Design a protein around this ligand. Structure first.
Ligand code: UDP
Length: 477
């Protein structure tokens, strides 16, 4: 109908990584379901995978007014080959897409009403500025991370020497102090190639017209209050703050024909441990051997997502790929798959995590505590074995364990020492079979209740998302 009113158009931009794409897909669907917004999500990826194709295909059929556009640049072998951390390469790949984004915006009769980018994608800000587009960052991390990020440029001036050498916890104004061993990966060495980019991220976030945050009032009342009211922090991070979390898959729709899920439905309630170290997590061959034996020795049911072990060229994580279909199985102990066929299912590379964590037969989650995975454990009330590896996962693991009370963790960080099969067996038993595990599942359940309330009608995050969506609507005004 050419005489019908057109909805205002919101653009989103997600950088490489399942942990950026998945929450951006969920936010995009939440926005479009308000029935007042045209939504286009531009996706930048590191490579083609079956997992990404299925995610994209599902989403591009969700709603008429929701569109997905693949902006992955066509000549990535050079950028992926850069001798740099995955963290830094995410920036480099995203930068290689900005010109194409600007091309898309220029061809439009009317510019988008808003642009929402992730923390790796703020090189799109000049594009927004040229077209008069309000720019928002969807910070897909938690408030504690946002506080640290707000204040890290001050920390850079005030602390001499390495953060990891400091004697006591790092004060963050108004907030829980940060243990030196828990600092965000780029802070682990001030000579790392991600440390300066992180300082730049800190500065550029202050230039946003608004910040959407994947947390909720009931989860992080102290950190949100510090961000909002502590002069040391609200003097720096001036943009308006919108907690809209949990932005996470909270409806899983029935799957026909999935071998994993069909098997899971045959297991007893709360009996299966899901084991998956995100999309990017990798472990050494030696650690993989201990984990395999730990799971076998526990005699608990499990679903274990495995990848190729760490190689010489690997850093702290690995760009997600699914072309090594069978290779990861080659690094299990001889006969493992057949020896554990009654209780254990091993999946190379990718599993249906949303459906598994929502399944009533799942009893626990051995997680690397990436923030999306953490949220998926919370929205489903699943207790956690915390196994942080990279990014801000050590902070997340501490949040889950010390503040929420929903997690068990090894004595020593897995990045500092191999976790033995004996400790693993003990952790798995504690979470799945023991009375302590029932207590942490009940705690998780309690946390879940307030998380779901936040995004249901009338919840704090639901209303905050409405408020944000009205700013986009007024931008059109
Ligand atoms: O086998 C897997 C591994 C990961 N995921 C999903 O990929 C995302 C990983 O994001 P996260 O923030 O936990 O960590 P990342 O791997 O990006 O560091 C989550 O939404 C996972 O549910 C999945 O579906 N299947």
């Amino acid at each position: 109908n050419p005489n019908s009113t057109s909805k205002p158009h919101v653009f989103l931009l997600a950088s490489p990584g399942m942990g950026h794409l998945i929450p951006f897909l969920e936010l995009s669907k939440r926005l479009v379901t308000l029935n007042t917004l045209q939504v286009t999500l531009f996706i930048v990826s590191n490579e083609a995978t079956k997992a990404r194709s299925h995610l994209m295909e599902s989403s591009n059929n969700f709603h008429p007014d929701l569109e997905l556009v693949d902006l992955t640049p066509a000549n990535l072998s050079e950028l992926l080959s850069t001798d740099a951390t995955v963290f830094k390469r995410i920036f480099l790949i995203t930068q290689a897409a900005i010109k194409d984004l600007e091309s898309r915006i220029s061809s439009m009769s009317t510019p988008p009403a808003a642009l929402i980018v992730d923390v790796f994608s703020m090189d799109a800000f000049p594009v927004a500025d040229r077209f008069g587009i309000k720019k928002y960052v969807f910070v897909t991390l938690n408030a504690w991370f946002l506080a640290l990020t707000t204040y890290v440029r001050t920390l850079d001036r005030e602390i001499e020497g390495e953060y990891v050498d400091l004697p006591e916890p790092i004060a963050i104004p108004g907030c829980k102090p940060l243990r030196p061993e828990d600092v965000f990966d780029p802070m682990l060495s001030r000579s790392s190639d991600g440390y300066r980019p992180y300082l730049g991220m800190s500065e550029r976030l202050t230039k946003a017209d608004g910040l959407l945050l994947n947390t909720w009032e009931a989860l992080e009342p102290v950190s949100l209050k510090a961000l909002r009211e502590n002069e040391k922090l609200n003097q720096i991070m001036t943009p308006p703050l919108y907690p809209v979390g949990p932005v996470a898959r909270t409806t899983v729709q029935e799957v026909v024909g999935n071998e994993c899920l069909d098997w899971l439905s045959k297991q007893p309630t709360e009996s299966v441990l899901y084991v998956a170290l995100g999309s990017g997590g990798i472990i050494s061959y030696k650690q993989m051997t201990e984990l395999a034996w730990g799971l076998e020795m526990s005699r608990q049911r499990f679903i274990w997502v495995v990848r190729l072990p760490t190689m010489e060229k690997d850093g702290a994580c690995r760009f997600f790929s699914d072309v090594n279909v069978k290779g990861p199985l080659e690094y299990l102990p001889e006969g493992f798959l057949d020896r554990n066929k009654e209780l254990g299912m091993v999946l190379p590379n990718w599993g249906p995590q949303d459906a598994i964590l929502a399944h009533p037969s799942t009893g626990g989650f051995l997680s690397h505590c990436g923030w999306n995975s953490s949220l998926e454990s919370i929205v489903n009330g699943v207790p956690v074995i915390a196994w942080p590896l990279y990014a801000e996962q050590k902070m997340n693991a501490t949040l889950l364990t010390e503040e929420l009370g929903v997690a068990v963790r090894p004595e020593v960080l897995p990045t500092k020492a191999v976790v033995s099969r004996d400790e693993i067996e003990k952790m798995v038993r504690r979470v799945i079979e023991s009375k302590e595990g029932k207590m942490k599942r009940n705690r998780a359940r309690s946390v879940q209740s307030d998380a779901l309330k936040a995004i249901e009608k009338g919840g704090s995050s639901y209303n905050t998302l409405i408020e944000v969506a009205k700013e986009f609507e007024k931008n059109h005004k």
